Structures are given as structure tokens and as C-alpha cells.
Design a protein around this ligand. Structure first.
Ligand SMILES: *[C@@H]1O[C@H](CO)[C@@H](O)[C@H](O)[C@H]1NC(C)=O
Ligand SMILES: [Cl-]
Ligand SMILES: [Cl-]
Ligand SMILES: [Cl-]
Ligand SMILES: [Cl-]
Ligand SMILES: [Cl-]
Ligand SMILES: [Cl-]
Ligand SMILES: [Cl-]
Ligand SMILES: [Cl-]
Ligand SMILES: [Cl-]
Ligand SMILES: [Cl-]
Ligand SMILES: [Cl-]
Ligand SMILES: [Cl-]
Ligand SMILES: [Cl-]
Ligand SMILES: [Cu+2]
Length: 235
């Protein structure tokens, strides 16, 4: 159970984004139904009043929390990967529009899932804003918690992969548009019962054999990290 508080741009807190520039759901409950429209931007997908301005090459940091800002972030049980996708805002997240900018599943060196490193990072993970056309975009941050993913939700609705999905409204002001955004995947629809990384037993299978769901990261993406950029306790 986890939610996005807001974003930072180049290490500068943009302030409380909840129902302002984040299409916030009412609570921190997971989505589990792979075919539901809730897979797009969670259960309350509507236009919110503001869009954070960035430029191509800026560092955009998402900040997650559990109950209050900079708390335990997410329960330690919730091992799993983190991805970030982008789509043109005009789409409203419908159609074949989502392009993957970032993927982190399991780091063999540190023996940590992306979620474990997100806790250590005070809920902060970043992407570098790609060189797409100037305009309005939705950035979709997705955590998959795998602690009950040995079962499929479609077969047993009390278990299944848990999806924590947040969509931020971002406006790209300056960009040279050197990497125009290609077509992407649909949410719902990219993930099915047979997609790799949706059904997995973290208790009995070694993390080193985990494969994150496709699509692969777009070659136009400029990277990202799971790492604290700012200290929320100074604001
Ligand atoms: C999943 O959501 C879809 C689309 O709204 C709906 O048809 C179906 O009843 C749900 N599946 C389960 C397993 O609850
Ligand atoms: Cl929880
Ligand atoms: Cl509810
Ligand atoms: Cl659901
Ligand atoms: Cl605005
Ligand atoms: Cl726990
Ligand atoms: Cl540029
Ligand atoms: Cl579907
Ligand atoms: Cl498995
Ligand atoms: Cl992977
Ligand atoms: Cl590509
Ligand atoms: Cl980064
Ligand atoms: Cl860190
Ligand atoms: Cl700081
Ligand atoms: Cu939870």
C-alpha cells in the first residue's frame, strides 16, 4: 500500500501534488485486475488542474509514501520491480500510447529488489526527461508487489500481483525533439495472465531468474535511478 505525494524537478520540491498535478486515487489500495480500466491511471483517472513544467534533460523525481510523507514508504513484504512510462496527454492514456522510460527489478550485486531500494531512498525515484516534442504528457509510475503473485487474480481474487499506479501531469516546455515519441502499449492490455513477471513465486524461485514484464525500455530514454534527491523534512 503506497501512493505518490508529489514530484521534484532538478532537486527542487514542486509541493503537494495530490489531486493537483497527480491523478490521485482515494486511497493506497492496489489494483489487481489486469483487464480493468483502473490499470491506466488507477481508480480516479480524470484531468486535474495543474501540469508541472520541465525541460528535456531535467531530472524528474517521484516521491511515494504509505500514510504520511517520508514514513516507511511501503511494507517491506512488497518486493517487486518499478517502471515509468510516458504518453501524450491528448490520449488520456487510451490506446497504444505508453512508452517505457525506466525499468528496475532486482540488483544481483546488492541482492535488493527495486522496492527495497525505494524504501532506503525515502520513496524517491527519478527519470531524465527525454527529448520528445514540447507539449503535455502523462508520466505513469508503476510498482508491482509480488508477495502474493504465485497465484493469478483471474483464478484467485484474494491473491495476485498488486499494482500501485500513479499518473502525473507534466508539461515539457523546452526540447530539441531529437527523439520523437514512438507508439507504445495499451494499459489495460500490455499485461496478461501469461506475460512474464506477472505470476512469480518470490519464496521458492531465486530473484535472479525474475524477468520484468515487457515492453523493453525505449532506446530514446536517458536513464534514471532509485535514490534520494531531497530531504522532505526540510520541506
Ligand atoms: C476485471 O475488470 C473487467 C473490466 O472492467 C471486468 O469485466 C471483470 O469483471 C473483472 N475481472 C475480475 C476477475 O473481477
Ligand atoms: Cl500493506
Ligand atoms: Cl476503496
Ligand atoms: Cl482491481
Ligand atoms: Cl498548469
Ligand atoms: Cl512487511
Ligand atoms: Cl533539448
Ligand atoms: Cl485487456
Ligand atoms: Cl516462479
Ligand atoms: Cl528484468
Ligand atoms: Cl526502442
Ligand atoms: Cl537519475
Ligand atoms: Cl538513497
Ligand atoms: Cl534537500
Ligand atoms: Cu500493500
Amino acid at each position: 500500500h503506497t501512493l505518490v505525494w508529489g514530484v521534484w524537478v532538478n532537486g527542487v520540491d514542486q509541493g503537494d501534488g495530490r489531486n493537483i498535478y497527480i491523478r490521485s486515487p482515494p486511497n493506497n489500495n492496489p489494483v489487481k485486475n489486469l483487464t480493468s480500466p483502473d490499470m491506466t491511471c488507477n481508480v480516479d483517472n480524470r484531468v486535474v488542474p495543474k501540469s508541472v513544467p520541465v525541460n528535456a534533460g531535467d531530472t524528474l523525481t517521484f516521491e511515494w509514501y504509505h500514510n504520511t510523507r517520508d514514513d516507511d514508504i511501503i511494507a517491506s513484504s512488497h518486493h517487486g520491480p518499478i517502471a515509468v512510462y510516458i504518453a501524450p496527454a491528448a490520449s488520456n492514456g487510451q490506446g497504444n500510447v505508453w512508452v517505457k522510460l525506466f525499468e528496475d527489478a532486482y540488483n544481483v550485486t546488492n541482492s535488493t529488489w527495486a522496492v527495497d531500494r525505494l524504501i532506503t531512498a525515502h520513496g524517491q525515484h527519478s527519470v531524465v526527461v527525454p527529448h520528445v516534442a514540447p507539449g503535455d504528457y502523462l508520466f505513469r509510475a508503476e510498482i508491482i508487489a509480488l508477495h502474493e503473485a504465485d497465484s493469478l487474480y483471474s483464478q484467485n481474487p484474494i491473491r495476485g500481483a498488486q499494482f500501485y499506479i500513479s499518473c502525473a501531469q507534466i508539461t515539457i516546455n523546452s526540447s530539441d525533439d531529437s527523439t520523437p515519441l514512438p507508439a507504445g502499449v495499451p494499459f489495460p492490455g500490455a499485461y496478461t495472465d501469461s506475460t512474464p513477471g506477472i505470476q512469480f513465486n518470490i519464496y521458492t524461485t531465486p530473484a535472479t531468474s525474475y524477468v520484468a514484464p515487457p515492453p523493453s525500455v525505449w532506446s530514446g530514454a536517458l536513464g534514471g535511478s532509485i535514490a534520494q534527491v531531497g530531504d522532505a523534512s526540510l520541506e
